[PDB]
Each structure stands twice: as structure tokens, then as C-alpha cells.
Design a protein around this ligand. Structure first.
Ligand code: HEC
Ligand code: HEC
Ligand code: HEC
Ligand code: HEC
Ligand SMILES: [Ca+2]
Ligand SMILES: [Ca+2]
Lengths: 329, 324
């Protein structure tokens, strides 16, 4: 066992490296990324005054220094949520065709907007009024949206953030460098894991540029008896189960930077990556791993960690006399 | 009115410009030298929300570098020394404040060497250290920053590193400093009338030196006027001068609403008018209040531009965050 050329050839049939840099989005030549929109989006992403309490920004739950996530079990950040979910990483989110953790199959079907806009309530008006009250924001929106008479809209808020989101990509992980042609980029163990990941059927669901993130499956995590009275490391506390009549579905989690984004699953109840791998060894989904395979895939998944964005923290617009006051709650 | 040379000369006897860059801290002689390794580790810690039991709150949360070094909210509770919720003061130029707390009884204030980060600091220290030790990138950074120490991951060192980072959170070259340094056109006529009124109406009794405050305490604080505008609050003497408040440092005041220890005033103009009162020996005309308000905007310096640190990755034995 262990031919690099064979392994690379096989991995190239199913995965793709993350690009070094994005130049446009929404190619279906798409929409040019521009410095002005990117910078406004960054400002918006870090501004806690876009929340009612004035403490919560996108950066709070999708923290760029912590793998694009908050490292906590669950939160509620978007109107489309039925309940609390683990925050997915913003890193590489631009590549995910499937935009939600879970839903009724037939409802996710005819659903266009992502989490930022889905459904979106009072918020848009409240966001715009907050933006309008600060002249530095108004000036920024006019520069980012030069062809727009009326540029401070919730759609434009969402558009500027999406442009910033497109810069939050993590090229040059060990796996990507292996893929490009560097044999020494991965260990023997990590290569054994790549091989096992591909042969045991994980790729049915975790494939393409993001190793997941593209489609939904009638399978999701549940607690076994006493899960909440058992050691947070303890094996066999949770397992995956097929939903009844396949009617409810979960997105196959995009596994890029997975080593950075514990805890795991839609409920954020698993803290060890090895345990998440063992849980995805299941007769029900059609994957079974030996102890060895589980160990090697775990080591493999560490190679999906890319170069983290280096981001200057923005200086936020000063509030003015009629900026809406934050709510205590 | 407005002999520039004379006004500048007057300002220099009572205020100082913010230095371009700090080189050492704790000069009591050559102080402690600032180093790259310590500043860097201090920045990581400052942004790391895993330093709180909830895993959500970092120093950055309440002292937000993109928001003038503050959270912009009326009050919070961040340090075991607080008697009650207080408006979070700015991190910007805090290094220069000899007075360390919003308020307290004169005596408890008198006996005390440790600032907010360390005062009264419980089980926190062990929890913090355990958390840092569980991540090898932290242990490496601590070894690099404190090379002379066999046991470098301590709560003392956590605070010492953050203190070095804090020393880079300074804001030189405000319009007032540029005027002080010789640029007559750095401030408008109104702003200069404001400087002049600030100096002659007695504000400098308490708001003086490099930070326009931050240096001592006074038996005077903000209280609400009953009712459930403009006459909503007033400054008042404490019950007998045993209870005192720190003269707020006015650097970057334009950026750090809301105002006063309770964070109940939103408009700078109103905070100025509040500080006009015979109680403290100040009295402003309508025109002086307005000129002083414009002037206080010349205290807004160059905001630090900081690369957001990439945090150490947690491991199997990193303590889990608390539901809260
Ligand atoms: C916590 C209180 C959050 C706030 C603040 C923000 N987000 Fe979020 N985000 C959060 C959760 C719990 C989820 C999962 C929702 C679900 O049930 O599917 C999300 C999801 C996203 C995504 C999708 C990522 C993907 O993999 O495709 C994106 C792009 C996203 N969120 C962006 C985002 C923006 C731009 C925010 C500021 C306006 C924001 N989030 C805040 C939790 C929280
Ligand atoms: C389709 C039937 C799947 C196959 C085959 C595999 N996975 Fe999977 N994975 C799938 C879903 C629907 C989910 C989310 C489930 C939930 O309840 O949250 C996942 C999730 C993971 C994770 C967690 C990643 C995260 O960010 O939380 C990991 C580490 C993972 N899956 C690994 C993995 C392995 C190694 C597989 C082959 C053995 C595998 N998955 C197969 C869908 C499907
Ligand atoms: C909100 C939950 C906060 C957290 C998180 C942090 N701080 Fe804080 N800080 C907060 C308040 C309400 C106050 C005033 C305390 C008082 O009543 O006097 C402070 C004060 C400071 C200061 C004093 C600054 C000055 O103007 O001289 C400093 C230097 C400071 N705090 C530092 C600091 C550090 C390093 C933090 C992370 C360890 C941190 N604060 C968190 C509110 C909150
Ligand atoms: C000594 C008795 C003082 C004199 C004279 C002046 N100020 Fe003051 N100031 C003082 C204290 C003790 C405080 C905080 C009190 C509290 O309850 O919080 C302040 C605060 C301010 C502020 C608010 C700044 C903030 O960051 O919250 C401003 C804008 C201010 N002071 C301005 C000001 C002016 C214009 C003065 C001359 C007319 C003046 N102060 C005098 C103490 C004292
Ligand atoms: Ca996660
Ligand atoms: Ca304030």
C-alpha cells in the first residue's frame, strides 16, 4: 500500500483545492469583488450595533480567530432557525450550495436566501435606520454601491458582507498541497486516512472543494440513554440515525478546517474529532471503519486545515445623537 | 482672542501630547522593556473569549478596539472589584491613568496596588492557567515571552503580557496634539475657543495631564434627577467625601458614549453642560459649553490598527465552556 500518484489521481476525481484568491462571486463572470464592498462588509461583520443588545456582531458567533466559529455548543443567530444550532464556520462558506443545517426536504427545496436573509421581520428597517444614523456608514455605502441612488438597504448590507465572506477562504492546507503535487505534504498516516475516507464511502456525502456542504441527507445526530450523565469524552454517547420516512434532512457538514471548529454536529455535543469520526462509522449510512481506519481518517482530517485569513480589525463608524440606543433585554 | 503662541504655551503648562510609541512601562527606573513576544501574546489573550468561563467573553468584548476601546453600552460587570455595574472605560491610553477604578471609598482606594485585571483575583487564576496550559501554542508563546522563568504560565504573567499589549493601545496625533506640536491650523477657531474656555473655567482642576483626567479622585459624581432631555442628570457631592469618583480621562471622549460611571448620558454636549456647576466651581455660558464640546472632539487620536490574532486551537483536555 501507498502509491502517491494513484492516491492523488483518485483524490482529484472527487475533491478540489481551495483557490488562492477569489476575483468574482455568483458565477452562474458573476459579480466582481471590489475593495469598497469587501471593506464595508468587514466593517458590517464586526459591528455589534447591528444587534438589538449592541453586543453581538457576526464576528461574535463566526469568530475569525477561532476557525470562523464561536467554539460553543449552540446559538440562535438567524430567523430561519427552528431552535439552537452549532454555528458553522464562515471560512469557505462561500462554496456551500446547501446553506442550512437542516429542514424539511420539501421546504429546503424551494428556498432561495441563505441564513443572513432567509425570512428577514423588524430587523431590516432597524438595521438601515442604525446604518443611516452614522455618516461614515452612509459614505461607505455610497462608495461600495456607486450606481445606486438608494444604497443603504438590507440587500446591500447582505451583498457587502457576502463580498467580505468571499475573502474568508483558507487555501494551502496540507491536503491541498499534496493534491497540487507535494508528496511530503502529508504523513503516511494522513495518506492512509485519505485512502480510507475515499474507499469506505465518506465521499458519497463529503466531496468537492469543501468535503461536504453541497446537499442534505436523511441522517442526524441523536443522544443515547444517559448521554447527559456521561463523561464529555466517553464514546457511544451519541449516534447518527435515519430520520423517519427520510422527510427531514441535514446538510453533510463541510469538513474543511474541522480540526478548528469543535464542538461537532448540528447540536454541538461532541467535543472530540475522533469520536465524531467513530459516529460516522455506521451501518445505517453505509460506512464502517476499523479502529485503524478511524484513527487514520481522524489524522487525515487535520490536513484540511488551511491558511487562516489575516484581517485588520476595522475601525467602526461613530454613533450619533439619533443612533438607536442598544436594548438591555 | 486667539494668540496661537500664547494659547499653545498655556496648554503646555497643563497638558501633554500622547507619545508616538511606548518603549518601556512601569518606570518608577528604566521600567520594564516592551517586547514583541509579550505584546503579541498579550494581544492573543486580549481577544481570547476562552479566558471566560462562558467561552463567549474576551477583553475585546467590553473594551472593543474598533469602538474606541469600549463596548458602547451603559454598564457591565467585568472585574471582581466593581461594587456594581459600571460603564466600561476605554483601553485606549489607559496605560497612562494613575487612578485605576471608577469609584470607591477614599480609604479602600488608598490601600491598593493592583488594577482592575488583577484586583481581588478567587478561582479564576487556576482556571485561566489550566486553560492556557492545555494548548501547546500558548505554552510555546509564554516560554518565548518569559524566557527567564522556569514556570512561565502564571496569572501574574497573563496580566503582564496583556499590560504590554495595552501599552501599544495609545492614540497619538489627535488634532489637539498636532496643534500642541506647532500646527496652528490643526484646530478651528471654535475648537481653540473651546480649549481656552476649558482651561479658564476650571475643568483642568480635575481634567489635566496627558489624558485630561484619570489621575485622581473626587467626592463628586453623577446622579439622576427624579421623574421617570437635558435636566435629567446632575453632578453632586457624595454624602461626606468618603465616597469618591475618578476624574474621567477625556481622550477619545467623542468615541466612547455613553458618558459617566453609570453610562446614562448619550450626547457629549449634555455631559459638558452637566459638568457646568457651582458644586465643582465651574460655570459655563451657552457659548462656552458649545465651544468646549467642539474642542473635546480634538482629543480623538489615531486609532490603533490591529491584525485580529489567530487563536490557539483547543485540545482534548481544554476545560469546557460553561452553559452560563
Ligand atoms: C449567533 C448569535 C450568530 C450570529 C450573531 C450570527 N450567526 Fe450566522 N449562523 C449562526 C448559526 C447558529 C448558524 C446555523 C444556522 C442553521 O440552522 O443552518 C449560522 C449560519 C450562518 C451562515 C451559513 C454558513 C454555511 O456553511 O453556508 C452564514 C454565511 C452566516 N451564518 C453568516 C452570518 C452573518 C453574515 C452574520 C452577521 C449579520 C451572522 N452570521 C451572525 C449563528 C450566528
Ligand atoms: C451521507 C449519508 C454521509 C456520509 C456517508 C458521511 N457523512 Fe459525515 N455527515 C453527514 C451529515 C448529514 C452530518 C451532520 C450531522 C449532524 O447531525 O450534525 C455529517 C457530519 C460529519 C462530521 C462533523 C463535522 C462538523 O462540522 O460537525 C464529521 C467529522 C463527519 N461527518 C465525518 C464523516 C466521515 C469520516 C465519514 C465516512 C466514515 C462520513 N462523515 C460519512 C453525512 C454523511
Ligand atoms: C465586561 C464584561 C468587561 C470585561 C470582559 C473586561 N472588562 Fe475591563 N472593565 C470593565 C468595566 C465595567 C471597568 C470599570 C471597572 C471599574 O468599576 O472601575 C473596566 C476597567 C478596566 C480597566 C481600567 C481602565 C482605565 O480607564 O484605567 C482596564 C485596564 C481593564 N478593564 C482591562 C481589562 C482586561 C485586560 C480585560 C480582559 C482580561 C477586561 N478588562 C475585560 C468591563 C469589562
Ligand atoms: C473636579 C471636581 C472636576 C472638574 C472641575 C470637572 N470634572 Fe469632569 N469629571 C469629573 C469626575 C469625577 C467625572 C466622572 C464622574 C461620574 O459620575 O462618572 C467626570 C466626567 C466628565 C465627563 C464624562 C467623560 C466620560 O468618559 O464618561 C466629561 C465630558 C467631563 N467630565 C467634562 C468636564 C468639563 C467640560 C469640565 C469643565 C466645565 C469638567 N469636566 C470639570 C471631575 C471633574
Ligand atoms: Ca462545529
Ligand atoms: Ca463611556
Amino acid at each position: 500500500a501507498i502509491d502517491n500518484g494513484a492516491l492523488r489521481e483518485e483524490a482529484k476525481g472527487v475533491f478540489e483545492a481551495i483557490p488562492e484568491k477569489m476575483t468574482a462571486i455568483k458565477q452562474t463572470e458573476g459579480v466582481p469583488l471590489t475593495a469598497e464592498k469587501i471593506e464595508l462588509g468587514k466593517v458590517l461583520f464586526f459591528d455589534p450595533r447591528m444587534s438589538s443588545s449592541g453586543l453581538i456582531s457576526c464576528q461574535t458567533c463566526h469568530n475569525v480567530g477561532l476557525g470562523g466559529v464561536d467554539g460553543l455548543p449552540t446559538s440562535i443567530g438567524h430567523g430561519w432557525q427552528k431552535g439552537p444550532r452549532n454555528a458553522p464556520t464562515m471560512l469557505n462558506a462561500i462554496f456551500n450550495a446547501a446553506q442550512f443545517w437542516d429542514g424539511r426536504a420539501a421546504d429546503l427545496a424551494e428556498q432561495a436566501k441563505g441564513p443572513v436573509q432567509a425570512g428577514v421581520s423588524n430587523t431590516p428597517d432597524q438595521v438601515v435606520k442604525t446604518i443611516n444614523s452614522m455618516p461614515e456608514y452612509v459614505e461607505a455605502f455610497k462608495a461600495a454601491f456607486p450606481e445606486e441612488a438608494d444604497p443603504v438597504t438590507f440587500d446591500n448590507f447582505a451583498a457587502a458582507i457576502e463580498q467580505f465572506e468571499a475573502t474568508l477562504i483558507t487555501p494551502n492546507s496540507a491536503f491541498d498541497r499534496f493534491l497540487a503535487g507535494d508528496d511530503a505534504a502529508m504523513t503516511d498516516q494522513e495518506k492512509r486516512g485519505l485512502q480510507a475516507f475515499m474507499e469506505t464511502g465518506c465521499t458519497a456525502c463529503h466531496y468537492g472543494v469543501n468535503f461536504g456542504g453541497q446537499d442534505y441527507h436523511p441522517f442526524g445526530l441523536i443522544a443515547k440513554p444517559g448521554a447527559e450523565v456521561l463523561p464529555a469524552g466517553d464514546t457511544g454517547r451519541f449516534e447518527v440515525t435515519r430520520t423517519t420516512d427520510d422527510e427531514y434532512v441535514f446538510r453533510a457538514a463541510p469538513l474543511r478546517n474541522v480540526a478548528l471548529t469543535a464542538p461537532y454536529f448540528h447540536s454541538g455535543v461532541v467535543w472530540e474529532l475522533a469520536e465524531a469520526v467513530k459516529i460516522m462509522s455506521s451501518a445505517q449510512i453505509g460506512t464502517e471503519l476499523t479502529d485503524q481506519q478511524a484513527e487514520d481518517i481522524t489524522a487525515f482530517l487535520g490536513t484540511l486545515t488551511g491558511e487562516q485569513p489575516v484581517i485588520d480589525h476595522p475601525i467602526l463608524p461613530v454613533r450619533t445623537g439619533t443612533t438607536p440606543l442598544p436594548t438591555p433585554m
